[PDB]
Design an enzyme around this catalytic site. Structure first.
Site, PDB file in Angstrom:
ATOM      1  N   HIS A   9      -5.272  -0.210  11.464  1.00 36.87           N
ATOM      2  CA  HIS A   9      -4.653  -1.354  10.821  1.00 36.87           C
ATOM      3  C   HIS A   9      -3.185  -1.437  11.158  1.00 36.87           C
ATOM      4  O   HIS A   9      -2.687  -2.515  11.458  1.00 36.87           O
ATOM      5  CB  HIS A   9      -4.838  -1.230   9.304  1.00 36.87           C
ATOM      6  CG  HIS A   9      -4.042  -2.212   8.501  1.00 36.87           C
ATOM      7  ND1 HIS A   9      -4.134  -3.574   8.680  1.00 36.87           N
ATOM      8  CD2 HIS A   9      -3.145  -2.023   7.504  1.00 36.87           C
ATOM      9  CE1 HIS A   9      -3.328  -4.180   7.827  1.00 36.87           C
ATOM     10  NE2 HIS A   9      -2.721  -3.264   7.096  1.00 36.87           N
ATOM     11  N   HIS A  52       0.786  -1.224   0.000  1.00 37.63           N
ATOM     12  CA  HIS A  52       0.000   0.000   0.000  1.00 37.63           C
ATOM     13  C   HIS A  52       0.822   1.282   0.000  1.00 37.63           C
ATOM     14  O   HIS A  52       0.292   2.327  -0.383  1.00 37.63           O
ATOM     15  CB  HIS A  52      -0.970   0.013   1.192  1.00 37.63           C
ATOM     16  CG  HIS A  52      -1.898  -1.163   1.226  1.00 37.63           C
ATOM     17  ND1 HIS A  52      -3.115  -1.163   0.583  1.00 37.63           N
ATOM     18  CD2 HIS A  52      -1.786  -2.376   1.817  1.00 37.63           C
ATOM     19  CE1 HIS A  52      -3.715  -2.324   0.779  1.00 37.63           C
ATOM     20  NE2 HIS A  52      -2.930  -3.077   1.526  1.00 37.63           N
ATOM     21  N   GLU A  76     -11.896  -3.862   1.787  1.00 34.88           N
ATOM     22  CA  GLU A  76     -11.002  -5.001   1.896  1.00 34.88           C
ATOM     23  C   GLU A  76     -11.738  -6.184   2.507  1.00 34.88           C
ATOM     24  O   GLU A  76     -12.599  -6.034   3.378  1.00 34.88           O
ATOM     25  CB  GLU A  76      -9.773  -4.649   2.739  1.00 34.88           C
ATOM     26  CG  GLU A  76     -10.088  -4.181   4.160  1.00 34.88           C
ATOM     27  CD  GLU A  76     -10.144  -5.301   5.184  1.00 34.88           C
ATOM     28  OE1 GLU A  76      -9.569  -6.376   4.932  1.00 34.88           O
ATOM     29  OE2 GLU A  76     -10.782  -5.104   6.238  1.00 34.88           O
TER      30      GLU A  76
END
Ligand SMILES: [Zn+2]
Ligand SMILES: [Zn+2]
Lengths: 633, 485, 590
Positions: free
Chosen positions: C155, C71, C201
């Site tokens: 995250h 990412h 996701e």
């Protein structure tokens, strides 16, 4: 569109605003200047404060010998220091919906209004503001708590006693509204209803309005607010530093295209020079430690002392005075330095670029790996077995009435060898020394202020010029000290406005143009019918779904305009099949007769008048004929 | 006198925003009238009622409501307020003043019938404003004025109005109606279960309360309390934390539920997410809920047992203290097979004085069915003693109650805990060592019931029993030993 | 009209690139590296959008979710040779942590291939200069209508989902959110804002994760058994990531049990973690925003420092080395050194990417070049991604009008779709690599309105005449700078064509023998009886008023068998007048 003004002090404001349906009450400042009217609270009793002559009125009727006590020609009332709250009775504060907080300096009055009114709404503030506000609240409640004093003084509040009191005690406003300090439970509860907002977070209220903050630069976490709909924008600036400082710099972009630019929170003293003034700080601090002797600094746990520490650290490397130690005495000291260290993304852009590198933003960390700054929670412990004469000591509340500052204001206040360095505004210098005179302690009034003064106030007003200006009279009227000069004032050329304590002002702009949203089937079921060049027109008919203060339009009378020509009317009647139609003229109109359906029509200037018989299909035919020779509105 | 002088001064000055506001503020802040003449001053308030600048009129009628709060007046002020509401209905400020005066008068003193709570309620219901002018506050007016023990339809059709503020006030009116009884109906359950997804804050935190109250009214929908409790568990997973506090607390107001769906909360999910999100508010509310529903349900309690032993590292002293409480309340017929190590090493802290005494209160009311658990608990508490020689009385109490609660489990410990070497003579231990005293008070509190224990001591142990019985009679109990008959 | 195109991560993990077009605005959602094969196909095909040309004219702004290599991976290639002088909007902690992490991956790449084609340092600093840092819940206007909006996710440190508003159309890209709270990270929170498309996701959707304590009690008992057998717990886990959660977990276990083991920490990014978590607590969980004044929870009194010469030590040894996928080489040095041993243990941290050693051991085979499997493995899953319960929570709390599933694999793709169509009834779609998913969005047009129109509208509406069509009116005017709807009479007075008061009159000719006064009385009675709920009154001078319609008994005509009744009305009641004329043509009762 009403501004209710509840605070009289210029830089600790409270302003309710009734906008569309909201009751946004901007800022809750607790006026601590009232605390200057009392005796201090020492943690251990001194023989000097205990043994003072009690003042007596010349009448002798009242039992005010035990009420108020005099010292060196200045009298003070002997009880727990009282606090000057705003009016909780002007409007019902349970109808206040959302409270907006600009900075931690105007948050100290929050527990009173949030647990003694009935305010069931929410309060919004940035998380640096709430963290430093929590630490300052704990600071205040701890210093007022430590040695309890009972409010045994009550008779000095009645009208005839207080006008028979001497100065400065005549200069006191609404002593009956003064209330004692607040407790643990409303500290915890006042910080539960608060919510965390970001710098220019586009945040909506009740489906009706939009509030948003901006960067101010007055302190770490300070915010300037905007209350706006889509077609109007009232902005509230309270505290700014466009001078070079540590926090994120002032925003000049969301201030413009606004109508009201309320000038709350300007400088305390316009006649100042902060860079040279902190140069003066370094100068007399160096002189006093060079003669050999400590310096005393009244200070808040946060704010400008941080800036002070920076230059003071630097000045050690210029002075060769690493021998003298630095002490920070506060019950919130470790947490204060922690929150100074951590709230770093809210600093300057180049300070953010300093955060890019793995280095501490505030340089007091470099003061503590060099073993220079020593922080202690209290004197009760590690300060006893580590204290080093001479020193630089930073103490409790700068009002000089409660904290550890009273202990060091005693003891050391006996020799001219030492000095005390007053550095913080909005507390009167000579009034702070008033219970302590007679006194041999050296004193320098060296106030460091970061708020913008009247020159940049004028620059701000000519930059983002509003439709209206709201400010107290202390900004309009010349200041009581330098009243002989006109120059340092508000300098604008709309008629500026003036509010005193507890006043009602109507903002002279009226809402007239509001906002509506349309679902696409109606948008496609509209036709343009352009009649006069540049100016289109369209017939709209729908129903309005009401929900959450944002009105919609959903599918489920337009009128006529334009004079009809009689000649074209009879010509198209002859060409549509109608026959033997006769026209005669009058002074201003025409009479036309159809023998079929026995019809007579008279036409005049902005006037038509049809008369028919009992018919339906010819009647509606004449209707659609006459309505298609004009323009619909 | 004073009121007449103040009215004369206000009439003589007659400044619009200057004299009126300052005079009203001084009259409010100075003192209360505390006399019936204030009602006559209400007539003076009627004198300035017919005037412009409605902020001054709002302040004046606020002062009138404050005077009505002193119970000086009665029905005459009510009639005057009704006349002012029916005549001076001019915009939201005067509407606020009139409705505040009506609310003050309705709860001033009488709160009775015969045009004291019915006519005022009818006038409030007949005067609903077009946009927020009285709407929320006339709903709370019709709230606090109950008509008769039979009017809920006007609140019912106002669950779907415009303003969320008016929704909240209709909710609070529904609350105050329930607090007076009034025998609430069944369609409120439907209007409430369609009211969860209002898509906005501050209504769900009370919609969960409405679900609770109309659920514990009576459980007859199709099963009613299971669906309502499932909706509450769904509201536990909300992102906002105030609604989580309200949902956990108002399910903690429940007392009846189906058993099987109550075990469904933990597997296939409310309490598996209801703990580890926020500060002490959500956690304490959820664990008080598990307190009451372990008290109400004799089953399930091993599940709340092992959902409490995980949450020891929450770094909050309040959470630790109230967690010790939330498992000391449910310590009935519950044993600790493997989850006793953490609850005895949790004592290891620098001071934790309230936490330590709470832990000693927990250890004396717990139940355990193993021997090595007793061994580890004793060695850990003796390590606590050797690290803090401060709380010997408290540990003597908890060891006394631990011996009294279960005597059987410590019978094999006595050959191991003390020096009882078979052929070597056991030396007399230090009497003034205040650690051997604790294990003695355990031993002789556990020796009251079991007969096979006097034969296992030694002569010095009987002389120690003699001195402990004669010295600390409130710690060791009387036994049937031949040495001390 | 909104279009979306995945240039990676559709049915894949790694090389996560999404291009979205909203009303002529092209926005780049996320860009990473494939974390896999060594060919040219670990970096996305930039020629799909431009081929030989500039990307500045097409693409407007660049958005980065977090600092994972899938990412925050392929940032230098956008900035330098493919070229992007425009803004790179991304959060403060991610901007603090991507440069050193991609520097570490540069070290791995030059140690692996010895290739100068990967990138250099001057160019990655050039990439880092033109990056605009984005705060917490915060708007940023890009040029003049494109709003971007960053929300806390949880995250990794500085992990945020983003939201893009163009006019009134919104798209929400959610990178790798976790609804399950972490220990030093919080949860995800998005205000329900009627989002059109939700890029979600779905890494973990076949399995429902249990409580967290199941995860650490299983991992800790297996670690305890491994160190009881004398095994050396080597965790193949990457940098900051799940590294410091497993660190604080092992630290808590080793300090509450007081067992001695010389644990270490990887080189390179070693103290970088210590100064990077101690400057970004406000992005972390609320436990350590309050519990940090006591000491440094982020400074570890049991961890130590590893180097290349300590790999041969016997005894207990619990160290972890980067990466988590076992593809860098130093962890592969450890693994190849420790391949023929049954007593030790390696593990896998979370999901795995195709082609790497992690997926290769996830399949369950032996040979690797061959390195036969003598180790033991267990699927511990601390890798912070939301389960299907997290999918339920975020989708049901956001309640979007459309969703798009990325960053996962096919079986749970179909499972998670069919679940989302059966419960929430929203148009769930399959994206793959390369195709353009098109949603025709509902347009919105805002116009203005006069205060008086809504004033009389609410005055009429709150009166009990609702639930029926009230048929509001007014007219709409084009200025091409604003689109204005104004009420009728105000339009009359502003366009200046004046109030056109209309007088439509008609003679009702009645043929009956009744008297004309009796005829007028009959007309009044008939109009009162037929027109229900109409204000029908009779005037004292023989006239009839029906709302704004006036009926007068006129003079007799020349026909004795004909009677004349004048009926006059305006255009505001034109339909009422037409109905009255129709009824009077139908005839009075006789
Ligand atoms: Zn990720
Ligand atoms: Zn990922």
């Amino acid at each position: 569109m009403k501004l209710y003004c509840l605070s009289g002090h210029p830089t600790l404001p409270c302003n309710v605003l009734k906008f569309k349906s909201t009751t946004i009450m901007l800022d809750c400042g607790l006026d601590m200047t009232s605390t200057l009217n009392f005796l201090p609270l020492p943690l251990v009793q001194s023989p000097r404060l205990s043994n003072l002559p009690g003042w007596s009125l010349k009448d002798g009727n009242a039992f005010l010998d035990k009420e108020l006590k005099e010292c060196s020609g200045h009298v003070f009332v002997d009880s727990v220091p009282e606090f000057c709250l705003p009016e909780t009775e002007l409007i019902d504060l349970s109808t206040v919906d959302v409270i907006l907080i600009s900075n931690y300096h105007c948050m100290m009055a929050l527990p009173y209004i949030t647990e003694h009114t009935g305010f069931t709404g929410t309060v919004y503030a940035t998380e640096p503001t709430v963290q430093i506000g929590r630490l300052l609240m704990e600071e205040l409640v701890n210093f007022i708590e430590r040695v309890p004093k009972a409010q045994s003084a009550s008779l000095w509040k009645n009208k005839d006693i207080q006008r028979l009191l001497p100065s400065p005690l005549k200069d006191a406003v609404e002593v009956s509204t003064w209330r004692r300090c607040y407790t643990m439970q409303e500290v915890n509860s006042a910080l539960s209803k608060i919510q965390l907002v970001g710098y220019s977070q586009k945040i909506e209220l009740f489906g009706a309005v939009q509030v948003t903050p901006l960067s101010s630069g007055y302190a770490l976490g300070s915010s300037n607010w905007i209350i706006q709909s889509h077609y109007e924008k009232v902005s509230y600036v309270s505290g700014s530093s466009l001078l070079t400082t540590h926090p994120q710099p002032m925003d000049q972009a969301s201030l413009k295209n606004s109508d009201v630019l309320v000038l709350t929170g300007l400088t305390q003293i316009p006649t100042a020079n902060p860079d040279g003034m902190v140069g003066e700080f370094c100068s007399n601090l160096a002189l006093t430690v060079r003669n050999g002797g400590n310096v005393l600094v009244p200070c808040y746990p946060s704010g400008v002392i941080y800036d002070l520490l920076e230059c003071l650290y630097q000045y050690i490397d210029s002075a060769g005075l690493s021998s003298v130690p630095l002490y920070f005495i506060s019950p919130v000291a470790n947490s204060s330095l922690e929150f100074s260290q951590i709230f770093a993304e809210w600093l300057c852009h180049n300070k953010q670029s300093k955060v890019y590198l793995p280095e501490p933003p505030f340089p007091h960390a470099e003061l503590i790996q060099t073993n220079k700054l020593k922080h202690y929670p209290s004197i009760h412990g590690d300060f006893s077995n580590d204290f080093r004469q001479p020193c630089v000591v930073f103490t409790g509340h700068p009002s000089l009435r409660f904290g550890d500052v009273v202990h060091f204001m005693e003891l050391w206040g006996k020799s001219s060898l030492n000095t005390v360095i007053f550095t913080e505004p909005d507390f009167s210098y000579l009034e702070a020394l008033a219970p302590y005179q007679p006194l041999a302690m050296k004193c320098i009034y060296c106030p460091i202020d970061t708020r913008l003064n009247f020159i940049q106030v004028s620059k701000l007003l000519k930059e983002v010029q509003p439709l209206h200006v709201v400010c107290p009279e202390q900004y309009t009227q010349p200041p009581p000290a330098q009243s002989h000069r006109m120059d340092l004032m508000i300098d604008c050329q709309p008629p500026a406005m003036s509010y005193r304590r507890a006043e009602v002002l109507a903002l002279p702009f009226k809402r007239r143009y509001e906002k509506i949203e349309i679902m696409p089937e109606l948008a496609d079921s509209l036709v343009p019918m352009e009649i006069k060049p540049g100016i289109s027109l369209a017939t709209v008919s729908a129903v309005l779904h009401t929900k959450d203060n944002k009105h919609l339009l959903q599918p489920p009378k337009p009128l006529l305009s334009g004079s009809i020509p009689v000649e074209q009317f009879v010509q198209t009647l002859e060409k549509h099949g109608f026959s033997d139609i006769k026209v005669e003229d009058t002074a201003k109109g025409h009479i036309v007769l159809l023998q079929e359906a026995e019809t007579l029509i008279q036409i005049e200037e902005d006037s038509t008048h049809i008369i028919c018989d009992n018919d339906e299909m010819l009647r509606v035919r004449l209707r659609d004929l006459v309505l298609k020779f004009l323009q619909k509105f | 006198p004073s009121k007449s002088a103040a009215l004369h001064i206000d009439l003589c000055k007659a400044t619009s925003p200057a004299d009126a506001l300052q005079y009203l503020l001084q009259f409010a802040r100075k003192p209360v009238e505390a006399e019936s003449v204030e009602g006559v001053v209400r007539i003076l308030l009627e004198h300035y009622y017919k005037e412009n600048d409605p902020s001054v009129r709002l302040k004046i009628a606020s002062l009138l409501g404050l005077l009505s709060k002193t119970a000086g007046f009665s029905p005459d002020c009510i009639m005057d307020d009704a006349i002012n509401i029916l005549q001076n209905e001019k915009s939201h400020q005067v509407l606020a003043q009139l409705l505040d005066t009506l609310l003050a008068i309705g709860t001033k003193l009488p709160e009775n019938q015969a045009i004291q709570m019915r006519l005022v309620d009818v006038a409030c219901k007949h005067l609903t404003d077009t946009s927020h002018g009285v709407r929320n506050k006339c709903l709370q007016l019709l709230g606090n004025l109950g008509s008769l023990e039979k009017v809920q339809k006007i609140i019912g059709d106002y669950f779907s109005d415009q303003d969320p503020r008016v929704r909240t006030a209709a909710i609070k009116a529904m609350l105050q109606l329930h607090e007076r009884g009034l025998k609430l109906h069944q369609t409120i359950y439907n209007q409430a279960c369609k009211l969860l997804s209002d898509d906005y804050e501050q209504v769900r935190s009370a919609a969960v309360q409405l679900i609770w109250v109309v659920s514990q009214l009576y459980p007859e929908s199709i099963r009613l309390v299971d669906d309502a409790f499932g909706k509450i568990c769904h509201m536990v997973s909300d992102g906002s934390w105030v609604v989580r506090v309200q949902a956990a607390k108002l399910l903690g107001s429940m007392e009846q539920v189906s058993s099987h769906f109550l075990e469904q909360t933990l597997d296939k999910g409310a309490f598996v997410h209801g703990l580890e999100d926020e500060m002490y508010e959500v956690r304490i509310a959820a664990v008080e809920a598990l307190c009451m529903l372990a008290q109400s349900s004799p089953s399930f309690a091993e599940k709340c047992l092992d959902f409490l032993v995980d949450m020891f590292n929450d770094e909050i002293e309040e959470v630790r203290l109230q967690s010790i409480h939330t498992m000391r309340k449910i310590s009935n017929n519950i044993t600790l097979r493997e989850d006793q190590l953490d609850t005895v090493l949790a004592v290891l802290e620098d001071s934790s004085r309230d936490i330590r005494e709470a832990l000693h209160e927990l250890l004396c009311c717990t139940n355990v069915s193993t021997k090595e658990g007793i061994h580890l608990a004793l060695v850990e508490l003796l390590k606590n003693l050797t690290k803090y020689p401060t709380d010997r009385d408290s540990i003597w109490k908890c060891l006394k109650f631990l011996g009294s609660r279960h005597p059987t489990l410590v019978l094999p410990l006595v050959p191991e805990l003390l020096s009882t070497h078979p052929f070597f003579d056991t030396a007399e231990p230090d009497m003034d060592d205040p650690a051997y005293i604790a294990v003695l008070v355990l031993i002789f509190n556990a020796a009251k019931t079991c007969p096979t224990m006097p034969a296992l001591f030694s002569d010095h142990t009987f002389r120690h029993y003699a001195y402990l019985r004669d010295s600390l009679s409130h710690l060791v109990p009387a036994l049937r030993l031949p040495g001390r008959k | 009209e909104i279009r979306v195109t995945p240039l990676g991560a559709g049915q894949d993990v790694g090389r996560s690139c999404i291009l979205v077009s909203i009303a002529g605005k092209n926005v780049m959602l996320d860009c990473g590296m494939h974390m896999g094969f060594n060919d040219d196909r670990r970096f996305p095909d930039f020629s799909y959008i431009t081929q030989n040309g500039r990307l500045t004219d097409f693409l407007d702004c660049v958005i980065i979710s977090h600092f994972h290599l899938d990412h925050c991976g392929a940032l230098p290639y956008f900035s330098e040779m493919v070229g992007y002088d425009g803004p790179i909007y991304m959060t403060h902690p991610t901007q603090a942590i991507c440069p050193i992490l991609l520097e570490d991956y540069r070290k791995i790449a030059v140690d692996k291939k010895g290739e100068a084609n990967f990138f250099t340092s001057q160019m990655i600093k050039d990439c880092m200069k033109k990056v605009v840092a984005v705060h917490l819940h915060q708007t940023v206007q890009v040029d003049d209508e494109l709003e971007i909006k960053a929300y806390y996710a949880g995250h990794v440190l500085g992990a945020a989902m983003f939201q893009i508003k163009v006019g009134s159309e919104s798209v929400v890209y959610t990178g790798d959110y976790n609804m399950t709270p972490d220990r030093h990270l919080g949860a995800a929170w998005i205000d329900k804002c009627r989002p059109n498309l939700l890029i979600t996701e779905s890494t973990y959707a076949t399995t429902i994760r249990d409580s967290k304590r199941c995860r650490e009690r299983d991992f800790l008992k297996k670690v305890h058994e491994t160190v009881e057998r004398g095994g050396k717990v080597l965790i193949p886990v990457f940098a900051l990531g799940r590294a410091q959660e497993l660190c604080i977990l092992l630290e808590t276990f080793w300090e509450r049990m007081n067992l001695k083991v010389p644990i270490y920490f990887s080189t390179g990014l070693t103290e970088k973690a210590n100064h990077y978590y101690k400057l970004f607590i406000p992005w972390t969980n609320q436990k350590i925003r309050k519990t940090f004044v006591q000491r440094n929870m982020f400074e570890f009194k049991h961890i130590k420092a590893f180097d290349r010469a300590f790999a041969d030590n016997p005894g207990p040894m619990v160290v972890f080395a980067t990466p988590g996928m076992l593809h860098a080489g130093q962890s592969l040095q450890i693994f190849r050194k420790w391949a023929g041993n049954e007593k030790n243990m390696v593990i896998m941290p979370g999901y795995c990417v195709q082609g790497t050693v992690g997926h290769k051991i996830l399949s369950g085979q032996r040979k690797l070049e061959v390195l036969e499997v003598k180790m033991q493995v267990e699927y511990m899953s601390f890798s912070a991604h939301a389960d299907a319960k997290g999918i339920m929570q975020l989708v049901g709390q956001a309640e979007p009008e459309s969703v798009l599933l990325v960053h996962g694999e096919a079986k749970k793709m179909e499972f998670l779709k069919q679940k989302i169509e059966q419960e929430l009834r929203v148009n769930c779609y399959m994206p793959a690599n390369g195709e353009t998913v098109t949603l025709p969005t509902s347009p919105s047009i805002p116009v203005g309105i006069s205060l008086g129109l809504l004033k009389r509208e609410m005055a009429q509406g709150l009166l009990p005449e609702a639930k029926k069509p009230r048929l509001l009116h007014g007219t709409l005017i084009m200025k091409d700078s604003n689109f204005r709807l104004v009420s009728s009479e105000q339009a009359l007075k502003e366009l200046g064509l004046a109030e056109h008061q209309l007088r439509f009159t008609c003679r009702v000719h009645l043929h009956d023998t009744r008297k004309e006064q009796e005829t007028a009385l009959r007309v009044y009675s008939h109009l009162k009886s037929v027109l229900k709920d109409h204000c029908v009154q009779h005037l004292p001078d023989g006239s009839v008023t029906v709302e704004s319609v006036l009926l007068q008994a006129a003079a007799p005509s020349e026909d004795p068998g004909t009677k004349v009744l004048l009926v006059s009305w305006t255009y505001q009641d034109e339909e009422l007048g037409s109905f009255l004329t129709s009824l009077l043509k139908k005839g009075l009762p006789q």
